[PDB]
């Protein structure tokens, strides 16, 4: 049950002015595509705060990738869900290498001691979080937050547009193209190319996704085949067949070194590390 | 639990081409605004059929308004949720005046025997439908369907843009403006002016809405005040404080006699009767 929003003063939406004229802001299945200029964060923050929302964020730092944690967490503190409850889950083989990072109020971190990229689906599935968070966000650790990433992303199931393919034809998408693999997508199918480095949703939907992809990967293994982009290939197959309820623009998954800063991106929020 | 969609071939969404350049297609709280060109109905039909969705439609035909039923139902048969399960609920004081209209398969009608406009909230609330339908759609009877109205509208809570105000400033919206009324909205607040003639959602959310508006109306009555546009005024207050998850364009609530057929409307779906 959701109580009423309080009185707020903000600009009137303009029905006869599109919010963006340069990009698609809704999918053909009526899921919002989240770009700067599509949302009023004061309204969303109200809505999610009134539900006392807690966001879990999963990150794997195995072997040498522990060196990415300090910047990742420090920048998360600055830009990820600020003002809401957050629970970081750091999956690692070196609990002692986890850096000591100061957290804001309402924010906590748990260290969970544990090919590597692929096995994430399995591990996320097993830890499905049900009692502790409302949403789960699953990301790569070799990244930093450079701008706002907040409750605008939250929804039962979301994927993110891979920054190498948001302008590409589906023929050019690097989907798994061998029929022998459970991740197989034909050249005449596909909505988008979603990035393996940033997906999420409610705990229930994320558990479902990660279970499905793990099961698919096991079948492929039993069949002596490995998907061309591993977890990302299976993620893409899952999201083709189970459409996400929100799609994040490449603002939320970017590499400025390789791609610069095009006019279509008003903000670069979550980026590869230089 | 939602099973996988089957393989389908349809045009690729174009991330760098907006679907509409003349209208706002998403609210600032990231609810889709449903216009022609925003949705692929084959994808939505798949999604809703896989859930065996049943849609209830409520309509009140009290006193002389029984004469509107024949056209209303005949045109609903042609254009409303065709291919899905539908349950019409006709609220009337003259069960014998309900015309005999031939229904397609999967479609049924119930006659429920019962100021008039206002009391709808109360009656809808009491009949909340929970065992028989997944969604409820609540409309005026003095209307006809002239084009597709389908599962693209379905969501936990929706309102429809009143056709007299979709281009107007919020100052010009005919909200209740007296602080004494529970429907009061100040001149600096308001997103949209929603029509009383077409709203809906899941049963739970509709029961909540109709209960809230009924309660508000009773308080106003006890206080010796009646909202300027009655149920519609209270609907608008409720939807200001509880944002809808989808907003229907005026394609879904139109009067061609009074407003013609502007270029911004590609389809006129649900219209006033000439
Ligand atoms: O020793 C590890 C390893 C991973 N992780 C964890 O796994 C995440 C993903 O790994 P990456 O970030 O490395 O992957 P991305 O390329 O960003 O990611 C891409 O390429 C991958 C294959 O490797 C392809 C690949 C491997 C090495 C070098 C270049 C590569 N390449 O691209 O051609 C997969 O196909 C991914 O799905 C895809 O998105 C890290 O952020 C850590 O959290 C650890 O903790 N510890
Ligand atoms: O004897 C009835 C009555 C209603 N209903 C049922 O109630 C519905 C709404 O009534 P209407 O469709 O009449 O209302 P709308 O104007 O479309 O509707 C507007 O004006 C209304 C006030 O009346 C204002 C009003 C009343 C009379 C004439 C002109 C009016 N006017 O606009 O200035 C309310 O303010 C509405 O919320 C508003 O949308 C009908 O479709 C029937 O289902 C019956 O079954 N049997
Ligand atoms: Mn990476
Ligand atoms: Mn009417």
From Swiss-Prot, chains A, B:
Residues binding UDP-N-acetyl-alpha-D-galactosamine, per UniProt: 60-62, 65, 140-142
Positions glycosylated per UniProt: 52
GO molecular function, one term: glycoprotein-fucosylgalactoside alpha-N-acetylgalactosaminyltransferase activity
Organism: Homo sapiens (Human)
Gene: ABO
Protein's name according to its UniProt entry: Histo-blood group ABO system transferase
Post-translational modifications: The soluble form derives from the membrane form by proteolytic processing.
Subcellular location: Golgi apparatus, Golgi stack membrane; Secreted
UniProt entry keywords in alphabetical sequence: Blood group antigen, Glycoprotein, Glycosyltransferase, Golgi apparatus, Manganese, Membrane, Metal-binding, Secreted, Signal-anchor, Transferase, Transmembrane, Transmembrane helix
Record note on domains: The conserved DXD motif is involved in cofactor binding. The manganese ion interacts with the beta-phosphate group of UDP and may also have a role in catalysis.
């Amino acid at each position: 049950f959701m109580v009423s929003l309080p009185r707020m003063v903000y600009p009137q939406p303009k029905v006869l002015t599109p919010c963006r004229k340069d990009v698609l802001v809704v999918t053909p299945w009526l899921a919002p595509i989240v770009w700067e200029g599509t949302f009023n964060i004061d309204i969303l923050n109200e809505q999610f705060r009134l539900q006392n929302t807690t966001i879990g964020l999963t990150v794997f730092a195995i072997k040498k990738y522990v060196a990415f944690l300090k910047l990742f967490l420090e920048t998360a503190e600055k830009h990820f869900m600020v003002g809401h409850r957050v629970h970081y889950y750091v999956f690692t083989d070196q609990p002692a290498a986890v850096p000591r990072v100061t957290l804001g109020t309402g924010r906590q971190l748990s260290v969970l001691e544990v090919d590597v990229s692929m096995r994430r689906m399995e591990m996320i599935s097993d830890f499905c979080f049900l009692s502790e968070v409302d949403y789960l966000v699953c990301v790569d650790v070799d990244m930093e937050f450079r701008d706002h990433v907040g409750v605008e992303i939250l929804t039962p199931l979301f994927g993110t547009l891979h920054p190498g393919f948001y302008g590409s034809s589906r023929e050019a998408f690097t989907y798994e193209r061998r029929p022998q693999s459970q991740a197989y997508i034909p050249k005449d199918e596909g909505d988008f190319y979603y990035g393996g480095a940033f997906f999420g949703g409610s705990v229930q939907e994320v558990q479902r996704l990660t279970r499905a992809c793990h099961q698919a990967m096991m079948v492929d293994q039993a069949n002596g085949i490995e998907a061309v982009w591993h977890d990302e290939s299976h993620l893409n197959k899952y999201l083709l067949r189970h459409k996400p309820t929100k799609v994040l623009s490449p603002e939320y998954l970017w590499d400025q070194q390789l791609l610069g800063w095009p006019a279509v991106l008003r903000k670069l929020r979550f980026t590869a590390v230089p």
